[PDB]
Amino acid sequence: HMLSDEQMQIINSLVEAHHKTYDDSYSDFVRFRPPVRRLSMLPHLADLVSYSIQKVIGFAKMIPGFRDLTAEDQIALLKSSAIEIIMLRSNQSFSLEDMSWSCGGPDFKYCINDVTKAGHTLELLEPLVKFQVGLKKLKLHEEEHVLLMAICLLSPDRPGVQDHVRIEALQDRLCDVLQAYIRIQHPGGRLLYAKMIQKLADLRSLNEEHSKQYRSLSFQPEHSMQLTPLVLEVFGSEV
Template identity: 70%
Template sequence: MQKNSVMESTVSTSTQVPEEYDRNVPRICGVCGDKATGFHFNAMTCEGCKGFFRRSMKRKASFTCPFSGSCSITKDNRRHCQACRLKRCLDIGMMKEFILTDEEVQRKKDLIQKRKDDEAKKEAQKPRLSEEQSTVISTLVEAHHKTYDDSYSDFSRFRPPVREGPVTRSASRAASLHSLSDASSDSFRHSPESGDGKLNLSSMLMMYQEQGSSPDSKEDDGSRLSMLPHLADLVSYSIQKVIGFAKMIPGFRELTAEDQIALLKSSAIEVIMLRSNQSFSLEDMSWCCGGPEFKYCVSDVTKAGHTLELLEPLVKFQVGLKKLNLHEEEHVLLMAICLLSPDRPGVQDHERVEVLQERVSEVLQAYIRVHHRGRLHYAKMIQKLAELRSLSEEHSKQYRTLSFQPEHSMQLTPLVLEVFGGQVT
């Protein structure tokens, strides 16, 4: 009987609530004044009066009032006169037609149970991160927080940026690119096919190239690269932070020292480029690494000796990565995958490194599934690693060129020279 009561409560509470009923008014049983639990058999009642009405109707009980037939029914005396209590039930609109038969109750019970089972099955089938995968993510996020400060508060002790000095042809052309950023920034919010007349990145870079000097014009080899000392310090500082991050990647320190060094030398600049995306702004295509004096535009990078062969794909990469709107968890997992690449030059134990990379890759794919990030999201992220390879090669090439020029190599730190293949003199 108690089970039937529960089931009928479920059904009866689904009765349409009268329009005049105010949900903010306390629910009071229309029969006895006790706290009501909902609409039962077409009236607002408590559980006690609901059960009394159901039993009375099913037994077809006939009650007689021992008094005058007009007893006042309250919470305390509702058991004293069944006749007046039943009369009160009918007076407030309770209807026997709303009472379910035992068969109907059972069918309803089975239906509710099936719904619960279906919901439980659906919940069980939802993708979830395992405890191990969650631990990997939390470890990498913690490692990132410990080795990356977006305010660059401890970088102020390095050589300050010097933006004065002769502007080379590359710097002039880069400034031209930067001046177009206002026209291009809106285009990053629209597809190239939008037809809104905005300048997109491809057309902007094409204009940028067309504005350059003739191929046979030469830069002054003696031009002072005013930003080279400062940006060399920034790269050196960032490499140290990447080393700290790598040491906290699960399994990295179990590799041989030779393989650790090989992985770091080949991937450090790529991880730095990934990290720098957090400070990259689509509004003016600059990197803000702290206060105003540590905000770098494209022309600043050219004053460190970098040319269009690096800067054009670098800007495209930063814009594309920014538009992926990566979660922090995805960002750190991508950095770890980048760093744990078994095909890096000098790596000896390829299989061991590959196992570590696959483990992190599986965690990233699981995270993407759990958070419904889209079927192609993982592929787009991995594509960014392919772009990083060519960027890294060009970056290293340009640093090696500087390292072989005595007047410039002395501006580079020993760590930068070692990582990018130069010799410490």
Template identity: 65%
Template structure:
């Protein structure tokens, strides 16, 4: 039996020997309890032994050799304070078959192991409390037996030693296991911290800027009302350096031939908005002006995020542009998952005015060929329950894809992406507990493949939209530039 304890642990030993010892003790306890007197109880513990003086409740031997049973599942509410059945002090668990405090646990073990015999100096019915439990050892011991504490549950000296060795062995094994676990290096953690900061700086969870977009129109309102507001780029993006979105700070120097398109003023004037609204019927695509501003705004935030990815600015200007143009819509779809709600399958960005349904996007010119797989993608991504760290790493990996059209230095882009991929895999192993971490990296990479298909469908539908002058003129210059045909 002792060998079994060494293999299965201390609690396993108690659970196996408890029924046997309980049966062995049943007959002797029933005989002892018939008389109900302390003298009958003492006779079963060898009355010829001398009395034992009071010993402190917390000696090291007691702590090492004490036996504690696991609580029966569901028997006790863990939030309710547990009371010692002997003295009323705070209990620490089941000890020798009863709920007791550490003091009464040690007292019972010492008394049983040394076959102690106590005599009550009073009437044999002292009420034991936390404060007076040391005054009458006889009544305290009687109370221990009355609540069900059993000497059969006390470990022998050999079992105590085995328990100590087992505890030490387990600690050593846990320490070894901990040392072998993968850990994020300081450099990897620094990259994660940078990406988190970049995301926090470029994503506003309050969506306060949405009020500056041209207003959403979900009904057959007049065209003048739909397009009355100027583009978001008139005021709120001045602080974002809107004239330098693809400028020298982000990309270095460009060929002069590209500059007029790349650095065009992105502000739609009030006069232009008014004149267009006079000639265009917005009843068909009433949400297009608002969503065009939303996408333009999101592109700028993606650019801001990309600038802060470690290593991104080391790339040639042309490669930075190629990466951003190709990945912008994919990163926007990734970012929008933060506002996507599974309950009603909408993107909720603050108030009801900015709660976007599938019908809203169809009123901006997109068909279900894009929207059905997009919603499926959002649901799947949401169910992965990604940590914010995993989310920002996935966005950075998406941007730094070496197989994007127009990328020249593919080896450098690939090395940057490989570094981020390694950090993501290490993070999942270290910080994402199972079962959520099972195949999580593979599922995240599959999401990037899904985004490629969504990107292709979006480009196809965007081209159909942009070929219609009455609709394309409602798009912002930045949207026209990023989703144009320079890179196809």
């Protein structure tokens, strides 16, 4: 077959949305509290994640249909999925040769050891890197990468969502685009759609573990004080 006009426009809009919210130069990173190598990396990684939440919000706003949901559903979707979108979009700076995220300098090269100096343990980080390796080996086209972020964000099985029918219909429309793209445009992707759906289930498990560990972190005033207001709101339990 052949991809349709509406499917084409969706892909174009999502790729443009990603290009507008992901800056390959990483030059904004000098504006964060500097990295230091008791939780010497938490200020820098809190700033990195806070910055990235703002980018994911800008991305969400350009997903076709997302802005038509109620503000409450948008926020519910964003709050539940933010850490997952961040884990996905970070694959773009992840390197197999270094087994770390490299963002334009040795100061902004993040390995597993750096994240333990931000309060997290191998219970999260070991699965997280295996996720990055397996996702890197999928060799996603940019179109697929951005579709998967939009699909992850538009999941209806999140706590706090009201219009479950409308959100599932949006997500279904993106899955169909992704399935048609893989069939037509990606040589040898017979098993790829299923592998990408499986990555979404990996993300759910990494979300749970991050949330557990974030709670232990954020309940200590000496540590929550080093977070940012946006991180506290997005990852918080306030309803």
